[PDB]
Amino acid sequence: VVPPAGTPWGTAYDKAKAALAKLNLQDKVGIVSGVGWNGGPCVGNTSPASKISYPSLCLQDGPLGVRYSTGSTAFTPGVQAASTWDVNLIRERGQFIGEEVKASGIHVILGPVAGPLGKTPQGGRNWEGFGVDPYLTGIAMGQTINGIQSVGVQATAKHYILNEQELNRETISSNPDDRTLHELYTWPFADAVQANVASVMCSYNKVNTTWACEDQYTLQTVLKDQLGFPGYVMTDWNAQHTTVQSANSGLDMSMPGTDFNGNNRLWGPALTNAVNSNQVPTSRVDDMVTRILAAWYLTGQDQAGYPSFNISRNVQGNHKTNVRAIARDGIVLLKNDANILPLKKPASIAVVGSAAIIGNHARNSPSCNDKGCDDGALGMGWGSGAVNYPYFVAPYDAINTRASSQGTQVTLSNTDNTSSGASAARGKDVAIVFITADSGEGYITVEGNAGDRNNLDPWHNGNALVQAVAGANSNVIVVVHSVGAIILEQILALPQVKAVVWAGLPSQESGNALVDVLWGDVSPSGKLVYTIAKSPNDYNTRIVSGGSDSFSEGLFIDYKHFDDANITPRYEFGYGLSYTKFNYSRLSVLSTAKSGPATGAVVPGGPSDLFQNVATVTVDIANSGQVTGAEVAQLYITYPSSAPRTPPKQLRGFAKLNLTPGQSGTATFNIRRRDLSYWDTASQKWVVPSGSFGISVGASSRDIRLTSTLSVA
Numbered sequence: 264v265v266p267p268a269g270t271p272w273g274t275a276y277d278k279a280k281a282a283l284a285k286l287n288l289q290d291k292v293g294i295v296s297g298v299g300w301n302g303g304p305c306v307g308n309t310s311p312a313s314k315i316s317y318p319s320l321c322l323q324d325g326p327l328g329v330r331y332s333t334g335s336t337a338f339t340p341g342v343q344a345a346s347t348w349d350v351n352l353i354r355e356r357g358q359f360i361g362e363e364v365k366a367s368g369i370h371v372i373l374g375p376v377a378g379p380l381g382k383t384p385q386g387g388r389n390w391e392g393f394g395v396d397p398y399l400t401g402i403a404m405g406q407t408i409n410g411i412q413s414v415g416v417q418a419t420a421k422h423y424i425l426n427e428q429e430l431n432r433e434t435i436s437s438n439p440d441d442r443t444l445h446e447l448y449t450w451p452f453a454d455a456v457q458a459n460v461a462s463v464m465c466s467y468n469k470v471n472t473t474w475a476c477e478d479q480y481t482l483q484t485v486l487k488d489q490l491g492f493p494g495y496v497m498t499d500w501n502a503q504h505t506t507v508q509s510a511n512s513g514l515d516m517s518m519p520g521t522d523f524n525g526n527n528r529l530w531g532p533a534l535t536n537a538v539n540s541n542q543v544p545t546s547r548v549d550d551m552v553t554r555i556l557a558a559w560y561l562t563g564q565d566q567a568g569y570p571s572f573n574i575s576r577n578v579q580g581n582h583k584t585n586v587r588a589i590a591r592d593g594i595v596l597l598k599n600d601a602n603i604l605p606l607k608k609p610a611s612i613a614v615v616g617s618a619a620i621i622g623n624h625a626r627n628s629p630s631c632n633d634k635g636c637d638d639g640a641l642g643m644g645w646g647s648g649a650v651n652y653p654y655f656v657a658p659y660d661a662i663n664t665r666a667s668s669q670g671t672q673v674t675l676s677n678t679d680n681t682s683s684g685a686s687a688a689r690g691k692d693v694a695i696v697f698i699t700a701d702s703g704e705g706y707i708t709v710e711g712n713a714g715d716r717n718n719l720d721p722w723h724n725g726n727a728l729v730q731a732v733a734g735a736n737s738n739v740i741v742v743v744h745s746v747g748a749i750i751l752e753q754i755l756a757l758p759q760v761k762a763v764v765w766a767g768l769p770s771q772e773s774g775n776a777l778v779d780v781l782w783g784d785v786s787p788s789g790k791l792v793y794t795i796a797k798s799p800n801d802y803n804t805r806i807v808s809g810g811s812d813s814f815s816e817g818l819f820i821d822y823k824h825f826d827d828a829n830i831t832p833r834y835e836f837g838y839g840l841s842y843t844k845f846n847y848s849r850l851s852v853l854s855t856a857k858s859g860p861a862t863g864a865v866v867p868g869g870p871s872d873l874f875q876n877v878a879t880v881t882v883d884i885a886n887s888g889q890v891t892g893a894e895v896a897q898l899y900i901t902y903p904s905s906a907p908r909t910p911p912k913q914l915r916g917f918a919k920l921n922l923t924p925g926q927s928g929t930a931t932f933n934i935r936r937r938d939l940s941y942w943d944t945a946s947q948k949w950v951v952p953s954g955s956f957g958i959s960v961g962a963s964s965r966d967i968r969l970t971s972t973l974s975v976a
């Protein structure tokens with residue numbers, strides 16, 4: 264409805280209303296209408312309103328840093344940040360991004376990403392988000408937006424909603440049932456809203472046959488009325504289709520204003536015309552401006568002294584510490600047989616694979632615009648969510664420096680030639696093989712991949728490369744840099760493969776991060792944020808070629824499908840090895856949670872009680888092994904069986920504890936009312952069912968160490 268007084272949004276609204284009263288229609292139309300594709304200096308720009316000292320609003324990509332900048336940090340993709348399971352690193356990433364954005368004189372950063380959530384492993388842009396889980400992605404969304412906006416920068420929660428594949432993204436209709444729409448996909452956007460996100464970007468796709476940027480139900484009823492979003496909705500780039508319907512459905516901002524060619528200017532003069540011809544009421548436009556100006560006042564951008572736009576400025580500072588930390592702590596150790604890792608003092612190391620060295624990807628090459636290539640070391644996927652590297656630390660260069668410092672001889676085979684890799688690996692103590700898979704936004708086809716991936720195999724003949732190295736060496740370590748799940752069964756069937764390092768997407772700090780882990784300066788502590796199956800056929804969704812995706816799987820995506828269908832994955836959601844072991848004890852559940860619908864008045868996030876704590880689950884974690892390591896403890900909740908069909912397990916908590924040998928620590932999971940709720944379609948309300956909730960705590964979604972119950976009368 265409207266934000267409550269005495270809150271940041273409430274005060275922003277008071278300011279916004281006073282500013283609105285000083286404006287005429289042209290002022291207002293200029294505020295809501297982008298100047299045109301490449302019409303201003305930024306990715307998006309609106310028209311200034313000097314009467315209220317409102318600048319031309321400057322909007323820039325993206326979720327991992329400042330796009331087109333030559334003096335900015337390339338932060339890790341969101342998927343790597345979520346792979347840390349570290350709320351502190353996640354918030355810091357947001358803060359550091361915020362700092363660079365403001366320092367570059369940009370008002371709005373186009374991120375973080377809650378949509379796509381990532382139901383299909385082949386999804387081209389899943390890596391921009393925070394994994395497959397709505398709870399984790401939601402927590403990550405909230406932490407990142409707190410971080411960004413604490414600096415005084417506007418964040419943009421995108422893409423709203425159901426943009427789960429790149430193929431035909433501008434035409435396909437996503438048609439899930441109501442409960443699925445709310446309880447799975449909308450969930451993380453509620454976290455974003457509750458975090459006071461300034462803006463939300465509507466998606467390219469249709470939702471139940473209606474384009475997302477024209478959908479009254481999702482934009483007005485769900486986002487604005489049910490989630491109580493007080494900010495503004497912008498379109499993805501040329502995702503607007505009508506002048507009048509888009510406006511009346513709840514669209515607030517036409518971005519960038521035209522199509523690539525300067526056509527399809529649906530607002531601007533056309534909006535002026537639609538208001539004058541009484542097709543769009545002035546009240547609607549007045550609401551657009553209030554939301555936009557409120558976001559400006561909320562972030563304090565009205566105050567004198569905001570830096571001017573300049574993406575040539577070196578705004579990096581020491582922010583690389585975050586990239587280093589996340590690239591490092593987001594690595595998932597998948598296999599460590601015979602404890603080959605960490606490496607001690609081997610006489611010789613073979614380094615094999617084109618992905619070991621600097622290539623056109625790391626170099627910001629003319630052959631790799633928008634990072635549309637997997638050439639040499641990989642740090643992120645491609646598209647609007649990619650940025651320029653200020654530098655790039657290749658795995659090889661970092662491995663060579665560390666190994667040479669201890670007398671270890673390094674032999675490099677820097678291509679993906681199987682015979683060269685064999686020659687390099689022959690007679691060496693260990694062989695480290697580098698493989699990749701890449702994907703991105705659906706306007707670039709890279710090596711026959713239209714955005715989404717064609718398959719879940721390693722690129723550049725990675726499987727055959729590993730097989731050749733295994734023919735020549737007993738002690739193979741496989742390092743994988745990837746936008747998502749790869750079927751590892753061919754690699755795992757080779758007895759010579761002793762270690763598998765799921766390194767993820769490390770950006771500029773690739774090599775340093777890997778060495779930290781490989782040599783055991785730190786223990787790996789990342790855990791998977793998606794399921795790695797034994798077969799491509801174990802996944803229950805595919806990239807759809809037709810005009811419709813019925814989302815027939817409903818609530819059962821990724822690990823929820825694997826649990827429901829009784830399928831054993833190779834590596835489950837929340838799985839990660841360490842150089843040490845941890846044990847869990849002393850499970851306690853404190854709860855005052857009461858059943859029924861949420862009852863609080865709608866504020867940002869929904870009814871005011873939904874994000875409030877109703878319960879607390881606690882476990883002790885001790886490092887029982889030989890070395891220092893951080894453990895990610897996970898809480899999974901099973902709803903009463905009397906409640907409507909729900910996945911058997913749902914992530915509803917996580918904690919990360921660094922523990923030296925013999926150290927014990929407390930993991931505390933705070934449970935919000937919504938964490939015990941399901942969406943009831945008939946009443947359009949979040950409801951806590953009565954009964955006994957299963958409480959499961961452990962090291963992964965399958966490695967449950969302790970169980971208890973939470974009882975709701």
Ligand SMILES: *[C@@H]1O[C@H](CO)[C@@H](O)[C@H](O)[C@H]1NC(C)=O
Pocket residue numbers: 573574575576577
């Ligand atoms: C942009 O910033 C760079 C680096 O700080 C500086 O050299 C240049 O003069 C600036 N450009 C403008 C137009 O102020």
